[PDB]
Amino acid sequence: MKLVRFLMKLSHETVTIELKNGTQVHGTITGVDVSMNTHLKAVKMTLKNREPVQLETLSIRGNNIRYFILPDSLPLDTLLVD
Amino acid sequence: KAHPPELKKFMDKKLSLKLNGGRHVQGILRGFDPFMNLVIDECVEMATSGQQNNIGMVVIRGNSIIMLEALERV
Amino acid sequence: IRPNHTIYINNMNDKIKKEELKRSLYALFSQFGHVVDIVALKTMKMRGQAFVIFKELGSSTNALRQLQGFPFYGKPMRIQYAKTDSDIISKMRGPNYILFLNNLPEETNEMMLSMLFNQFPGFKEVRLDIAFVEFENDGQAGAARDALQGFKITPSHAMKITYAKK
Amino acid sequence: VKLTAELIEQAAQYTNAVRDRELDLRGYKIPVIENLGATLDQFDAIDFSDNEIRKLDGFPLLRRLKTLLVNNNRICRIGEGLDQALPCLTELILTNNSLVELGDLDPLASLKSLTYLSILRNPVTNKKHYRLYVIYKVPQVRVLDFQKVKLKERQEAEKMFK
Amino acid sequence: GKSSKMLQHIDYRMRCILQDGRIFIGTFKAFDKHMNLILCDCDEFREKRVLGLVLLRGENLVSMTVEGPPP
Amino acid sequence: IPNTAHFANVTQIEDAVSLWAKLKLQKASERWQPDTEEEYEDSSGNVVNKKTYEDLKRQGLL
Amino acid sequence: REEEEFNTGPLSVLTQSVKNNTQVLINCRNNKKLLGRVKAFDRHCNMVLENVKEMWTEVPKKPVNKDRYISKMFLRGDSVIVVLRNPLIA
Amino acid sequence: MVQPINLIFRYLQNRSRIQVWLYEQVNMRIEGCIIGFDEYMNLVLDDAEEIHSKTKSRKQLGRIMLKGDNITLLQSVSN
Amino acid sequence: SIGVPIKVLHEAEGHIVTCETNTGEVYRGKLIEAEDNMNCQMSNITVTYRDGRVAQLEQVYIRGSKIRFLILPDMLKNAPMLK
RNA sequence: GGAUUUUUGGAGCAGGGAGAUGGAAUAGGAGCUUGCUCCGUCCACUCCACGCAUCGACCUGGUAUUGCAGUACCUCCAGGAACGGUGC
């Protein structure tokens, strides 16, 4: 029903987030709030026509995230049960 | 919540409003609204060449309101 | 004029930018001490003048004495003491051991003598046209005797500081 | 009292008068400037006044370093790898140093981003045609010893020793 | 749950990237529900622009990361 | 602030610091401080100037 | 109230994608069309899908088109512009 | 004080032709007679026409349901 | 119900501040009225935009919808803003 | 708790025209290397419509102000226009 409870239970997983400006940040999801505030640690960000930069921490808002990319070994069938 | 904007001092005063896309209008305000909607009676809009065109009483919504400058001392 | 932490320089070139002149004044004042603030305006009232407020009053006095009449961007700037206290300094604020003083003004209170002796570090006590100032340190008392020998305080008379005898 | 990581981590850092992040490292008497990797290029200005540094070298790669205060020191030689470690170095205050010859200003020509240089109160400034040699060797510098470089001084520097 | 993601970076220097491509590096002091950041003595890089205490709205924020140690 | 019978049944910080300021002022007042409390008449004029403290006398006799 | 509006309104067109396990296409604002099976949906059109294929066209900055495949992805309802259901799984 | 909702109700009762400008689009506007309104400023124009100021053309569509999120300015015309 | 940056903006009313809009317009002057929805009404204001068209107006009013940032002095960053 | 001031976005895309103009060291295809010919990607100069007008920052020369303050920015004249954004 609510996607925020499913996104909050995806902690300690290496995922990727593509923004609306073409910047893709790949990192381990460590913190998710009700407003989809993605706080990741040891992330790598690649902007549009720029070099990738590695950061120890990153905080991306929910309104600035356009798409997400999860690994194929993620238990989406078990995490969907509330 | 839902507090109205402080537009009591700018009532019945000739002010110039800016709208999105680079639009400029000038007119006297005739009321207020909690959704930042302004009614400008006998409004005149500035064209691209510089000529002013009188459009009469118009209604400007708050979604495209950029800046309103009062041309009269309040 | 009493010495303070803020030194005001005037008669400078007003044709340069404000930020470039402020950076040049900061680079000039960094050689004498830590510059806490730099007030520089370019209006019609404050044209061609600026000021630097430092942490210590001795560094500001050394910058006012050393850079007196120094050429700055083609024009020799004149440095002097500030008339009032700075706002940042007011916000942040709120041989022998005994030295003999002669020809002291009688109208000066103990607070003015404490503010004059505050250039040296903390002393033991003060005694009040003759006065006796005893410091807790020997080197601080020697520096206070070498600094107050002919100081510029109450310029109608001349103050003389000498070391006490046994 | 050498410059280490514990001395840089315990040093005060704040905003200067030009709204830049400056760390106050004065009053340390460091004989050699080293171990600057603990700052991680988080400071825009370096306040190393009143020290005992002999050579301005040994600095790591810091792209955010734009101002260097080396006043009241004994700097007599400049490192040749200053451009590879500070590409954005624009302010260099070397007043009251131990520079005696103009040949120490030859590694200073590699800093293309340097615009403000101070070489006052030095025996190298008392030599003949020192300002013309500094203008000819470093054309990127616009302000030398709190003086704006004019076109006549550039023409006099380009005429002699061409 | 704990909501300690914004409280751990309090009183620290962080660099926030804007939507138009600007970067504001300042000391984050407080926040709100609308992600209103108050950066005291902040610098604007894209060139250096002296700004100082800049109160940027949360609608123009994209990403934020740690810049260095607290002053 | 030392632990004495004066600071008993006092549980708040600012109350303790204010009562400490009060007790300090009281005791420091009621002692005999010879440095500022004393009347010396130096032999500079030897028949005048009895307003000399205990420090100005050393400065004049140095 | 909410379940009847979700099973009788436009969201039922999403609910036919997860119940019958059909393939639908989503055209986004970045000129990209992702065809896949909708696995999880919500009221804010948060679509978590599996085995998606995204196709678009790019310029060198003549241009050329391109496509790629993802095992499992999740897209918010803000960037979803067009959603088309077509019998393409058969 | 004249309310904008009361002005919209008076314009709907008078059945006069009004022109609506779009948000971030100065080249094309709409023109028609507003019949009814709602809380979300949804206009129902009968025999509406899209006027393009760049090409100087007018294309009629008929009954149009214009949303209030796109209409930035609305003025009254005599035509 | 009231945020701490909203309270800092309401407490800074009457000082020489500036508000930079999303289009680049910087309205500078004394903040006369500051509501909870970032509505800044200033008197004797000055327009210095990213376009650079610097002018002086008697009164200006910028809403919080197109407001990008606000540059305030550092007189209120010490107390009671220390938390 | 997706319907105007914040978080389910009004965002995406392209830089005017011409000239027997010039270049792809290692990176286009076809006429199945090399030489030549043709066509859907830039920068430099020239011409029409220095794309246009505006203000801010900035450089040269002349010129005025000698003034104690907590600042969007600060004298004026003329030339050049490397930069920013606004409307067409």
Side-chain angles (χ1 to χ4, degrees), chain A residues 22 27 31 42 52 62 71 75, chain B residues 2 4-5 21-22 27 31 34 47 50 56 62 70, chain C residues 3 27 33 40 48 50 58 63 69 71 74 76 82 94-95 105 121-122 131 139 141-144 147 150 155 158 164, chain D residues 5 11-12 17 27 31 37-38 45 58 60 79 81 85 87 103 107 109 123 139 157, chain E residues 1 21 26 30 52 58 68-71, chain F residues 1-38 45 60, chain G residues 9-10 36 40 60 63 77 87 90, chain H residues 4 32 36 48 62 68, chain I residues 3 5 12 14 24 29 34 52 55 64 73 79-80:
Chain F
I1 309 171
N3 246 10
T4 36
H6 310 250
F7 298 99
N9 309 94
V10 169
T11 58
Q12 276 198 343
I13 295 198
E14 63 179 292
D15 283 337
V17 313
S18 147
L19 192 79
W20 177 241
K22 181 157 120 84
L23 277 173
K24 235 163 161 202
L25 185 135
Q26 200 196 120
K27 259 174 303 162
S29 147
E30 189 162 29
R31 319 142 163 269
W32 160 247
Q33 29 253 321
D35 318 297
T36 165
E37 265 173 294
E38 200 128 346

PDB file of all heavy atoms in Angstrom, chain B residues 30-32 37 55 58-61, chain H residues 1-4 72-76, unseen atoms left out:
ATOM      1  N   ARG B  30      -7.797  45.508  -6.044  1.00  0.00           N
ATOM      2  CA  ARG B  30      -9.169  45.676  -5.575  1.00  0.00           C
ATOM      3  C   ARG B  30      -9.567  44.639  -4.530  1.00  0.00           C
ATOM      4  O   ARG B  30     -10.731  44.614  -4.116  1.00  0.00           O
ATOM      5  N   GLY B  31      -8.642  43.793  -4.097  1.00  0.00           N
ATOM      6  CA  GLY B  31      -8.969  42.791  -3.098  1.00  0.00           C
ATOM      7  C   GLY B  31      -7.783  41.896  -2.831  1.00  0.00           C
ATOM      8  O   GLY B  31      -6.702  42.065  -3.404  1.00  0.00           O
ATOM      9  N   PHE B  32      -8.005  40.929  -1.943  1.00  0.00           N
ATOM     10  CA  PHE B  32      -6.982  39.967  -1.564  1.00  0.00           C
ATOM     11  C   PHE B  32      -7.589  38.572  -1.558  1.00  0.00           C
ATOM     12  O   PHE B  32      -8.806  38.395  -1.677  1.00  0.00           O
ATOM     13  N   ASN B  37      -4.204  35.326  -5.004  1.00  0.00           N
ATOM     14  CA  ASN B  37      -4.839  35.778  -6.234  1.00  0.00           C
ATOM     15  C   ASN B  37      -5.198  37.252  -6.105  1.00  0.00           C
ATOM     16  O   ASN B  37      -5.862  37.655  -5.143  1.00  0.00           O
ATOM     17  N   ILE B  55      -5.950  46.087 -20.437  1.00  0.00           N
ATOM     18  CA  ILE B  55      -6.749  44.866 -20.445  1.00  0.00           C
ATOM     19  C   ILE B  55      -7.935  44.939 -19.502  1.00  0.00           C
ATOM     20  O   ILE B  55      -8.757  44.012 -19.485  1.00  0.00           O
ATOM     21  N   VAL B  58      -8.359  42.332 -14.435  1.00  0.00           N
ATOM     22  CA  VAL B  58      -7.796  41.006 -14.645  1.00  0.00           C
ATOM     23  C   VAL B  58      -7.568  40.347 -13.290  1.00  0.00           C
ATOM     24  O   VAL B  58      -7.586  40.994 -12.242  1.00  0.00           O
ATOM     25  N   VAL B  59      -7.355  39.035 -13.328  1.00  0.00           N
ATOM     26  CA  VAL B  59      -7.118  38.232 -12.133  1.00  0.00           C
ATOM     27  C   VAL B  59      -5.817  37.468 -12.329  1.00  0.00           C
ATOM     28  O   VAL B  59      -5.683  36.701 -13.289  1.00  0.00           O
ATOM     29  N   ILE B  60      -4.863  37.678 -11.424  1.00  0.00           N
ATOM     30  CA  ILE B  60      -3.557  37.032 -11.475  1.00  0.00           C
ATOM     31  C   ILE B  60      -3.484  36.009 -10.350  1.00  0.00           C
ATOM     32  O   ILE B  60      -3.737  36.342  -9.183  1.00  0.00           O
ATOM     33  N   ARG B  61      -3.139  34.774 -10.697  1.00  0.00           N
ATOM     34  CA  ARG B  61      -3.028  33.710  -9.713  1.00  0.00           C
ATOM     35  C   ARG B  61      -1.680  33.772  -9.001  1.00  0.00           C
ATOM     36  O   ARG B  61      -0.726  34.398  -9.468  1.00  0.00           O
TER      37      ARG B  61
ATOM     38  N   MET H   1     -13.238  45.512  -0.788  1.00  0.00           N
ATOM     39  CA  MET H   1     -12.451  44.354  -1.194  1.00  0.00           C
ATOM     40  C   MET H   1     -13.244  43.456  -2.138  1.00  0.00           C
ATOM     41  O   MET H   1     -14.329  42.986  -1.796  1.00  0.00           O
ATOM     42  N   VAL H   2     -12.695  43.223  -3.326  1.00  0.00           N
ATOM     43  CA  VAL H   2     -13.325  42.384  -4.339  1.00  0.00           C
ATOM     44  C   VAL H   2     -12.596  41.050  -4.374  1.00  0.00           C
ATOM     45  O   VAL H   2     -11.389  40.998  -4.637  1.00  0.00           O
ATOM     46  N   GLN H   3     -13.326  39.968  -4.111  1.00  0.00           N
ATOM     47  CA  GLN H   3     -12.732  38.643  -4.112  1.00  0.00           C
ATOM     48  C   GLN H   3     -12.574  38.124  -5.541  1.00  0.00           C
ATOM     49  O   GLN H   3     -13.390  38.434  -6.414  1.00  0.00           O
ATOM     50  N   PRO H   4     -11.515  37.352  -5.807  1.00  0.00           N
ATOM     51  CA  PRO H   4     -11.367  36.759  -7.147  1.00  0.00           C
ATOM     52  C   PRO H   4     -12.406  35.696  -7.454  1.00  0.00           C
ATOM     53  O   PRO H   4     -12.785  35.539  -8.620  1.00  0.00           O
ATOM     54  CB  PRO H   4      -9.948  36.169  -7.114  1.00  0.00           C
ATOM     55  CG  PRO H   4      -9.245  36.922  -6.031  1.00  0.00           C
ATOM     56  CD  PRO H   4     -10.297  37.189  -4.996  1.00  0.00           C
ATOM     57  N   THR H  72      -2.407  31.272 -15.872  1.00  0.00           N
ATOM     58  CA  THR H  72      -1.668  32.240 -15.070  1.00  0.00           C
ATOM     59  C   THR H  72      -2.389  33.577 -14.955  1.00  0.00           C
ATOM     60  O   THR H  72      -2.454  34.156 -13.865  1.00  0.00           O
ATOM     61  N   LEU H  73      -2.934  34.083 -16.060  1.00  0.00           N
ATOM     62  CA  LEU H  73      -3.636  35.359 -16.066  1.00  0.00           C
ATOM     63  C   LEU H  73      -4.901  35.236 -16.899  1.00  0.00           C
ATOM     64  O   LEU H  73      -4.915  34.545 -17.919  1.00  0.00           O
ATOM     65  N   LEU H  74      -5.960  35.910 -16.457  1.00  0.00           N
ATOM     66  CA  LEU H  74      -7.243  35.900 -17.142  1.00  0.00           C
ATOM     67  C   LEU H  74      -7.759  37.325 -17.259  1.00  0.00           C
ATOM     68  O   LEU H  74      -7.898  38.021 -16.249  1.00  0.00           O
ATOM     69  N   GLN H  75      -8.043  37.753 -18.485  1.00  0.00           N
ATOM     70  CA  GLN H  75      -8.558  39.088 -18.751  1.00  0.00           C
ATOM     71  C   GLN H  75      -9.860  38.986 -19.530  1.00  0.00           C
ATOM     72  O   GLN H  75     -10.125  37.992 -20.213  1.00  0.00           O
ATOM     73  N   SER H  76     -10.675  40.030 -19.422  1.00  0.00           N
ATOM     74  CA  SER H  76     -11.976  40.085 -20.074  1.00  0.00           C
ATOM     75  C   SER H  76     -11.860  40.847 -21.388  1.00  0.00           C
ATOM     76  O   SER H  76     -11.286  41.939 -21.429  1.00  0.00           O
TER      77      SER H  76
END
